[PDB]
């Protein structure tokens, strides 16, 4: 098309969120509970030491 | 503007009819009664001849 601004609005409609950024979000939210448990058990060990 | 087709629609809005063509219409409609009278009196003369 020759319509100004049509390309990026159509791209935005086609891709609400990028694939790689969505996968980054997925992997980060998957890793969050593991890091939470790691830090929690580390501080539990610190409490046990004292 | 970069909008396709805006230039000619704006030209059409600005100039509903061209100036020279409007003046041609004016002069032609002004001449019409003169030609009508000329031909009419010519045929009246032809009738008078016979």
Swiss-Prot record, chains A, B:
Binding partners and assembly: A connexon is composed of a hexamer of connexins. Interacts (via C-terminus) with TJP1. Interacts (via C-terminus) with SRC (via SH3 domain). Interacts (not ubiquitinated) with UBQLN4 (via UBA domain). Interacts with SGSM3 and CNST. Interacts with RIC1/CIP150. Interacts with CSNK1D. Interacts with NOV. Interacts with TMEM65. Interacts with ANK3/ANKG and PKP2.
Family membership: Belongs to the connexin family. Alpha-type (group II) subfamily.
Protein's UniProt name: Gap junction alpha-1 protein
Protein localization: Cell membrane; Cell junction, Gap junction; Endoplasmic reticulum
Extracellular topological domain residue ranges: 1-21
Function: Gap junction protein that acts as a regulator of bladder capacity. A gap junction consists of a cluster of closely packed pairs of transmembrane channels, the connexons, through which materials of low MW diffuse from one cell to a neighboring cell. May play a critical role in the physiology of hearing by participating in the recycling of potassium to the cochlear endolymph. Negative regulator of bladder functional capacity: acts by enhancing intercellular electrical and chemical transmission, thus sensitizing bladder muscles to cholinergic neural stimuli and causing them to contract.
TM segment ranges: 22-42
The species this protein was found in: Homo sapiens (Human)
Signal peptide extent: none
Entry's disease: Oculodentodigital dysplasia: A disease characterized by a typical facial appearance and variable involvement of the eyes, dentition, and fingers. Characteristic facial features include a narrow, pinched nose with hypoplastic alae nasi, prominent columella and thin anteverted nares together with a narrow nasal bridge, and prominent epicanthic folds giving the impression of hypertelorism. The teeth are usually small and carious. Typical eye findings include microphthalmia and microcornea. Oculodentodigital dysplasia, autosomal recessive: A disease characterized by a typical facial appearance and variable involvement of the eyes, dentition, and fingers. Characteristic facial features include a narrow, pinched nose with hypoplastic alae nasi, prominent columella and thin anteverted nares together with a narrow nasal bridge, and prominent epicanthic folds giving the impression of hypertelorism. The teeth are usually small and carious. Typical eye findings include microphthalmia and microcornea.
């Amino acid at each position: 098309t020759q319509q100004p601004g049509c390309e990026n609005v159509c791209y935005d409609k086609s891709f609400p969120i990028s694939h790689v950024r969505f996968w980054v979000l997925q992997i980060i939210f998957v890793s969050v509970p593991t890091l939470l448990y790691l830090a929690h058990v580390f501080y539990v060990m610190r409490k046990e030491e004292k």
